Amino acid sequence: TVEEYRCISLKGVIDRLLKYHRYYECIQICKLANERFLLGYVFTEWAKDKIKGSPDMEDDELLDKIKSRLSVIDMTDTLQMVAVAKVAYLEGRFQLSRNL
Amino acid sequence: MNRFWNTKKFSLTNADGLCATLNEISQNDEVLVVQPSVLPVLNSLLTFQDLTQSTPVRKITLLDDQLSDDLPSALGSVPQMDLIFLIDVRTSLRLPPQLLDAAQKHNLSSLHIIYCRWKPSFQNTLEDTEQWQKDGFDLNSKKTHFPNVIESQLKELSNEYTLYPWDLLPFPQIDENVLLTHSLYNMENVNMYYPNLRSLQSATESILVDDMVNSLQSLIFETNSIITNVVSIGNLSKRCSHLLKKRIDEHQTENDLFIKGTLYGERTNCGLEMDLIILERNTDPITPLLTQLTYAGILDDLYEFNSGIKIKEKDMNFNYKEDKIWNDLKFLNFGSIGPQLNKLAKELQTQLQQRQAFLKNHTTLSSDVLKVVETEEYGSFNKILELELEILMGNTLNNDIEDIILELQYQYEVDQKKILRLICLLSLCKNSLREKDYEYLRTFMIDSWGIEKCFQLESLAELGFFTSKTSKSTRLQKEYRYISQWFNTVPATFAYSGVVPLTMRLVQMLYDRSILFHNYSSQQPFILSREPRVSQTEDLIEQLYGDSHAIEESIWVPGEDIALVVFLGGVTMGEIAIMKHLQKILGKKGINKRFIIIADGLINGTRIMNSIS
């Protein structure tokens, strides 16, 4: 309802749906709500989950996908990928971490 | 300020920031310790009385090895609250060892230092209010940076690192129209463009251009301007323009590109133009060496101005914001000062005592200068003028030059610098010197002025000043007698031996090709163009520099006037005199513009000679 929506910010709503592995629905609320501040917060979570997901991938294709999905987003706030590079470095993938 | 460059308004911000920082240091009795190089700049901004009344500090000192012996005398005494050092680390990237040795020896229990930096406009007024706690700590600045910059070398003694970033932006001192940035000297008094060590030129040049770009970016973002046309001259200016464009296009915030769409934009414009003509001193080494004839020029080459605009021998200040007699006589010719002073003195007789004191001091100083011009190697001050005038038009003969160079070497006593400057001008005017005269001139030089002169004549023989007939850095490889035909430097002109500077005509040609119409012209794209353009003027500058790529014309926007003519490599103050004449004549002809001359530091002949030594 409208009153409950006042208690918690839009980020509280976006987190609840990012939790359950639905990365396309969220990115559509931000467009209609006319917001840009909370745009990259979805992308960073999606990239972290994708990197920490399928381990039997290939570096070149993974980087190609992770950089082609960045083309859609055109905004500079909370788009820090240092954490993404770190979590990539936290496991065996080192060349991909350096290339990111 | 706010699209209208109120230059004097820049002065208040620095003083306010410094006062706020000093008063927020501590509410006790303070003692100030100031670096020797930066102190003259501070004194030119804040007076001693205002400094004492505004903040409770009561003592100022100097960074010297004398303080080491005075550590038990001066540092041990006073110290009512603490010691606040002030340092400049914008260049040379090295803290002075004086504070390093004083910290461990005297064992200070509270270390607070002040370091200078340009205004960070990218901080955009603290970016609102951190976005209501960064929307739940969505953004943070902890460890999101390199551990330290430059000052990482300070990792000794205690943890008293209460650094304070005092801001600084350019402000005018010598005159209202012209600002000035001090980036041409280090703390060791070494020239930032002509260092006396021919092994590290490239890095020094890169550092100088980086600092100049940073200062220009600071000013541009402070004034909220949108550059539309760029006319780059030379090699280094190309890199400077490209770096400035990249840095502007990268670090700019939002809420202004939206304005960049509204203003200017596609299919429309709002008639706002700013120009950024850039030159390099190496392009025209013809006229930093001529003799000054204007009042401040004559007063400058005989008594060197320090970082502040003042002199050691006298006591009265030459600041323009409190006196009006100096305003109307600084740039006038020396000859037209006497009768003007006589009229000014006689008109007041019929007719407050501060004016009387000012006129008396000016009269005494003028009389002293006139007395010292003569009776001090009488005739030399004029003989050099006649010789320079004769050489510029060209009257050298076969082997007769060797007769006149030693004619005044010991008949009238003269300094080394005058002879070296004159011989450099001789070797540069003809664009080439044969291989049969160096064997005698160098021999006589090494004969008369020691053994180390060979090193000077070798090091100076590669920058282009001293070349022989038998990454180019844009030297000049054309005879000057030719340039006297395309251009009308030798006929309107003052501050020299009746010669128009080469930069003068270079900037003249960009807006009105009148003198170029009289000689070497059958057709031109225009006669009076408001916007700067360069076309059908390549071959003349192709031979003048050996490459048809020194000229660069850049349009940034897709589609009365403020022109920023920066000067990378110093300003010969005689050019400032002719700049006002250019502005007046252009305004008379129909094109109305305003010129702001950005300078990296006053440059002069003798001041160059000690540099390459």
Side-chain angles (χ1 to χ4, degrees), chain B residues 308-351:
Chain B
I309 188 65
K310 61 188 56 50
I311 197 64
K312 37 177 180 289
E313 62 174 1
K314 304 314 189 322
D315 49 352
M316 73 291 291
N317 48 1
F318 307 97
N319 190 291
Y320 79 101
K321 309 173 310 170
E322 79 279 8
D323 213 338
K324 64 90 176 179
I325 296 307
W326 177 240
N327 261 324
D328 310 348
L329 313 178
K330 43 176 169 194
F331 277 75
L332 299 196
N333 209 34
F334 198 87
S336 43
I337 288 174
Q340 160 71 254
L341 194 52
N342 304 141
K343 182 257 290 194
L344 191 149
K346 72 168 298 304
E347 70 91 14
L348 188 149
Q349 169 260 329
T350 79
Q351 301 167 355

Coordinates of all heavy atoms in Angstrom, one line a residue, chain B residues 308-351:
Chain B
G308 N 56.6 38.3 -5.2 CA 55.7 39.5 -5.0 C 56.1 40.6 -5.9 O 57.3 40.8 -6.3
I309 N 55.1 41.5 -6.2 CA 55.4 42.7 -7.1 C 55.9 43.8 -6.2 O 55.1 44.7 -5.7 CB 54.2 43.0 -7.9 CG1 54.6 44.1 -9.0 CG2 52.9 43.3 -7.1 CD1 55.6 43.6 -10.0
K310 N 57.2 43.8 -5.9 CA 57.8 44.8 -5.1 C 59.3 44.7 -5.3 O 59.8 43.8 -6.0 CB 57.5 44.6 -3.6 CG 57.9 43.3 -3.0 CD 57.3 43.1 -1.6 CE 55.8 43.2 -1.6 NZ 55.2 42.3 -2.6
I311 N 60.1 45.5 -4.6 CA 61.5 45.6 -4.8 C 62.2 45.7 -3.4 O 61.6 46.3 -2.4 CB 62.0 46.7 -5.7 CG1 63.4 46.4 -6.2 CG2 61.9 48.1 -5.0 CD1 63.6 45.2 -7.0
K312 N 63.4 45.2 -3.3 CA 64.1 45.2 -2.0 C 64.6 46.6 -1.6 O 64.5 47.0 -0.4 CB 65.2 44.2 -2.0 CG 66.0 44.1 -3.4 CD 67.1 43.2 -3.4 CE 67.8 43.1 -4.7 NZ 67.0 42.5 -5.7
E313 N 65.2 47.3 -2.5 CA 65.9 48.6 -2.2 C 64.9 49.6 -1.7 O 65.2 50.4 -0.8 CB 66.6 49.1 -3.4 CG 65.8 49.4 -4.7 CD 66.6 50.0 -5.8 OE1 67.9 50.2 -5.6 OE2 66.1 50.3 -6.8
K314 N 63.7 49.7 -2.3 CA 62.7 50.7 -1.9 C 61.8 50.1 -0.9 O 61.9 48.9 -0.4 CB 61.9 51.1 -3.1 CG 62.7 51.7 -4.3 CD 63.7 52.7 -3.8 CE 64.4 53.4 -4.9 NZ 64.6 52.5 -6.1
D315 N 60.9 50.9 -0.4 CA 59.9 50.5 0.7 C 58.5 50.6 0.3 O 57.7 49.8 0.7 CB 60.2 51.3 2.0 CG 60.3 52.7 1.7 OD1 60.3 53.2 0.5 OD2 60.4 53.5 2.7
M316 N 58.1 51.6 -0.5 CA 56.7 51.8 -0.9 C 56.3 50.7 -1.8 O 57.1 50.2 -2.7 CB 56.6 53.2 -1.6 CG 57.2 53.3 -3.0 SD 59.0 53.2 -3.0 CE 59.3 54.8 -2.2
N317 N 55.1 50.2 -1.7 CA 54.5 49.2 -2.5 C 54.1 49.7 -3.9 O 53.6 50.9 -4.0 CB 53.4 48.5 -1.8 CG 52.4 49.4 -1.2 OD1 52.5 50.6 -1.3 ND2 51.4 48.9 -0.6
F318 N 54.1 48.9 -4.9 CA 53.7 49.2 -6.2 C 52.3 48.6 -6.5 O 51.9 48.5 -7.7 CB 54.7 48.7 -7.3 CG 56.1 49.2 -7.0 CD1 57.0 48.4 -6.4 CD2 56.5 50.5 -7.4 CE1 58.3 48.8 -6.1 CE2 57.8 50.9 -7.2 CZ 58.7 50.1 -6.5
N319 N 51.5 48.3 -5.5 CA 50.2 47.7 -5.7 C 49.3 48.7 -6.3 O 49.3 49.9 -5.9 CB 49.6 47.2 -4.4 CG 48.4 46.3 -4.6 OD1 47.3 46.9 -4.9 ND2 48.5 45.0 -4.3
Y320 N 48.5 48.3 -7.3 CA 47.6 49.2 -8.0 C 46.2 49.5 -7.3 O 45.5 50.4 -7.7 CB 47.3 48.7 -9.4 CG 46.3 47.6 -9.5 CD1 45.0 47.8 -9.9 CD2 46.7 46.3 -9.1 CE1 44.1 46.8 -9.9 CE2 45.7 45.3 -9.1 CZ 44.4 45.5 -9.6 OH 43.5 44.5 -9.6
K321 N 45.9 48.7 -6.3 CA 44.6 48.8 -5.7 C 44.4 49.9 -4.7 O 43.3 50.2 -4.2 CB 44.2 47.5 -5.0 CG 44.3 46.3 -5.9 CD 44.1 45.0 -5.1 CE 44.9 44.9 -3.8 NZ 44.5 43.8 -3.0
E322 N 45.5 50.6 -4.4 CA 45.5 51.7 -3.4 C 46.1 53.0 -3.9 O 45.9 54.1 -3.3 CB 46.2 51.3 -2.1 CG 47.7 51.4 -2.2 CD 48.4 50.2 -2.8 OE1 47.6 49.4 -3.4 OE2 49.6 50.1 -2.8
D323 N 46.8 53.0 -5.1 CA 47.4 54.2 -5.6 C 47.0 54.3 -7.1 O 46.9 53.3 -7.8 CB 48.9 54.2 -5.5 CG 49.5 55.5 -5.3 OD1 48.8 56.5 -5.7 OD2 50.6 55.6 -4.8
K324 N 46.8 55.6 -7.5 CA 46.4 55.8 -8.9 C 47.5 56.5 -9.7 O 47.4 56.6 -11.0 CB 45.1 56.7 -8.9 CG 45.2 58.1 -8.3 CD 45.6 59.1 -9.3 CE 45.5 60.5 -8.7 NZ 45.9 61.6 -9.7
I325 N 48.5 57.1 -9.1 CA 49.6 57.7 -9.8 C 50.4 56.6 -10.6 O 50.7 56.8 -11.8 CB 50.5 58.4 -8.9 CG1 49.8 59.6 -8.2 CG2 51.8 58.9 -9.6 CD1 49.2 60.5 -9.3
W326 N 50.6 55.4 -9.9 CA 51.3 54.3 -10.6 C 50.4 53.7 -11.8 O 51.0 53.2 -12.7 CB 51.6 53.2 -9.6 CG 52.2 52.0 -10.2 CD1 51.7 50.7 -10.1 CD2 53.5 51.9 -10.9 NE1 52.6 49.9 -10.7 CE2 53.6 50.6 -11.2 CE3 54.4 52.8 -11.2 CZ2 54.8 50.1 -11.9 CZ3 55.5 52.4 -11.9 CH2 55.7 51.1 -12.3
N327 N 49.1 53.9 -11.7 CA 48.3 53.3 -12.8 C 48.5 54.0 -14.1 O 48.5 53.3 -15.1 CB 46.8 53.4 -12.4 CG 46.2 52.2 -11.8 OD1 46.6 51.1 -12.2 ND2 45.4 52.3 -10.8
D328 N 48.7 55.3 -14.1 CA 48.8 56.0 -15.4 C 50.2 56.2 -15.9 O 50.4 56.9 -16.9 CB 48.1 57.4 -15.2 CG 46.7 57.3 -14.6 OD1 46.2 56.2 -14.5 OD2 46.2 58.4 -14.2
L329 N 51.2 55.7 -15.2 CA 52.6 55.9 -15.6 C 53.4 54.6 -15.7 O 54.5 54.7 -16.2 CB 53.3 56.8 -14.6 CG 52.6 58.1 -14.1 CD1 53.5 58.8 -13.1 CD2 52.3 59.0 -15.4
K330 N 52.8 53.5 -15.4 CA 53.6 52.2 -15.4 C 54.0 51.8 -16.8 O 55.1 51.4 -17.0 CB 52.8 51.1 -14.7 CG 51.3 51.1 -15.1 CD 50.6 49.9 -14.5 CE 49.1 50.0 -14.7 NZ 48.3 49.0 -13.8
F331 N 53.1 51.9 -17.7 CA 53.3 51.4 -19.1 C 53.6 52.5 -20.1 O 53.8 52.2 -21.3 CB 52.1 50.5 -19.6 CG 52.2 49.1 -19.1 CD1 51.8 48.8 -17.8 CD2 52.5 48.1 -19.9 CE1 51.9 47.5 -17.3 CE2 52.6 46.8 -19.5 CZ 52.2 46.5 -18.2
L332 N 53.8 53.7 -19.6 CA 54.1 54.8 -20.6 C 55.6 54.8 -20.8 O 56.4 54.2 -20.1 CB 53.7 56.2 -20.0 CG 52.2 56.4 -19.7 CD1 51.9 57.9 -19.6 CD2 51.4 55.8 -20.9
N333 N 56.0 55.4 -21.9 CA 57.4 55.5 -22.3 C 58.2 56.4 -21.3 O 57.6 57.3 -20.6 CB 57.6 56.1 -23.7 CG 58.8 55.6 -24.4 OD1 59.3 54.4 -24.2 ND2 59.5 56.4 -25.2
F334 N 59.5 56.1 -21.1 CA 60.3 56.8 -20.1 C 60.3 58.3 -20.5 O 60.3 59.2 -19.6 CB 61.6 56.2 -20.0 CG 62.4 56.6 -18.8 CD1 62.2 55.9 -17.6 CD2 63.2 57.7 -18.8 CE1 62.9 56.2 -16.5 CE2 63.9 58.0 -17.6 CZ 63.7 57.3 -16.5
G335 N 60.5 58.7 -21.8 CA 60.6 60.1 -22.1 C 59.4 60.9 -21.8 O 59.5 62.1 -21.5
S336 N 58.2 60.3 -21.9 CA 57.0 61.1 -21.6 C 56.5 61.1 -20.2 O 55.4 61.2 -19.9 CB 55.8 60.5 -22.5 OG 55.9 59.1 -22.5
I337 N 57.5 60.9 -19.3 CA 57.2 60.8 -17.8 C 57.5 62.2 -17.2 O 56.8 62.6 -16.3 CB 58.0 59.7 -17.2 CG1 57.4 58.3 -17.6 CG2 58.0 59.8 -15.7 CD1 58.1 57.1 -17.1
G338 N 58.7 62.8 -17.5 CA 59.1 64.0 -16.9 C 58.1 65.1 -17.1 O 57.5 65.6 -16.1
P339 N 57.8 65.6 -18.3 CA 56.8 66.6 -18.5 C 55.4 66.3 -17.9 O 54.7 67.2 -17.3 CB 56.7 66.8 -20.0 CG 58.0 66.3 -20.5 CD 58.4 65.2 -19.6
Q340 N 55.0 65.0 -18.0 CA 53.7 64.6 -17.4 C 53.8 64.8 -15.8 O 52.9 65.3 -15.2 CB 53.4 63.2 -17.7 CG 52.4 62.5 -16.8 CD 51.0 63.0 -16.9 OE1 50.5 63.8 -16.0 NE2 50.3 62.7 -18.0
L341 N 54.9 64.4 -15.2 CA 55.1 64.6 -13.8 C 55.1 66.1 -13.4 O 54.6 66.5 -12.4 CB 56.4 63.9 -13.3 CG 56.5 63.7 -11.8 CD1 55.3 63.1 -11.2 CD2 57.8 62.9 -11.5
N342 N 55.8 66.9 -14.3 CA 55.8 68.3 -14.0 C 54.4 68.9 -14.1 O 54.1 69.7 -13.2 CB 56.7 69.0 -15.1 CG 58.1 68.4 -15.1 OD1 58.7 68.3 -16.2 ND2 58.6 68.1 -13.9
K343 N 53.6 68.5 -15.0 CA 52.2 69.0 -15.1 C 51.4 68.6 -13.9 O 50.7 69.4 -13.3 CB 51.6 68.6 -16.4 CG 50.2 69.1 -16.6 CD 49.1 68.0 -16.3 CE 49.2 66.9 -17.4 NZ 48.0 66.1 -17.3
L344 N 51.6 67.3 -13.5 CA 50.8 66.8 -12.4 C 51.2 67.5 -11.1 O 50.4 67.8 -10.2 CB 51.1 65.3 -12.2 CG 50.2 64.5 -11.3 CD1 50.0 63.1 -11.8 CD2 50.8 64.5 -9.9
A345 N 52.5 67.8 -10.9 CA 53.0 68.6 -9.7 C 52.5 70.0 -9.8 O 52.1 70.5 -8.7 CB 54.5 68.5 -9.6
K346 N 52.5 70.7 -10.9 CA 52.2 72.1 -11.0 C 50.6 72.3 -10.9 O 50.2 73.3 -10.4 CB 52.7 72.7 -12.2 CG 52.0 72.3 -13.5 CD 52.4 73.2 -14.7 CE 52.0 74.6 -14.4 NZ 50.5 74.8 -14.1
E347 N 49.8 71.3 -11.3 CA 48.4 71.5 -11.2 C 47.9 71.4 -9.8 O 46.9 72.0 -9.4 CB 47.7 70.4 -12.1 CG 47.8 69.0 -11.6 CD 46.6 68.6 -10.7 OE1 45.6 69.4 -10.7 OE2 46.7 67.6 -10.0
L348 N 48.6 70.6 -8.9 CA 48.2 70.5 -7.5 C 48.6 71.7 -6.7 O 48.0 71.9 -5.6 CB 48.8 69.2 -7.0 CG 48.4 68.7 -5.6 CD1 48.5 67.1 -5.6 CD2 49.3 69.2 -4.5
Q349 N 49.5 72.5 -7.2 CA 49.9 73.7 -6.4 C 48.8 74.6 -6.1 O 48.6 75.2 -5.0 CB 51.1 74.4 -7.1 CG 51.4 75.8 -6.6 CD 50.8 76.9 -7.4 OE1 50.6 76.8 -8.6 NE2 50.5 78.0 -6.7
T350 N 47.9 74.9 -7.2 CA 46.7 75.7 -7.0 C 45.8 75.1 -6.0 O 45.2 75.8 -5.2 CB 46.0 76.0 -8.3 OG1 45.3 74.8 -8.7 CG2 47.1 76.2 -9.4
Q351 N 45.6 73.8 -6.0 CA 44.7 73.1 -5.1 C 45.2 73.2 -3.7 O 44.8 74.0 -2.9 CB 44.5 71.6 -5.5 CG 44.0 71.4 -6.9 CD 44.2 70.0 -7.4 OE1 44.8 69.2 -6.8 NE2 43.6 69.7 -8.6

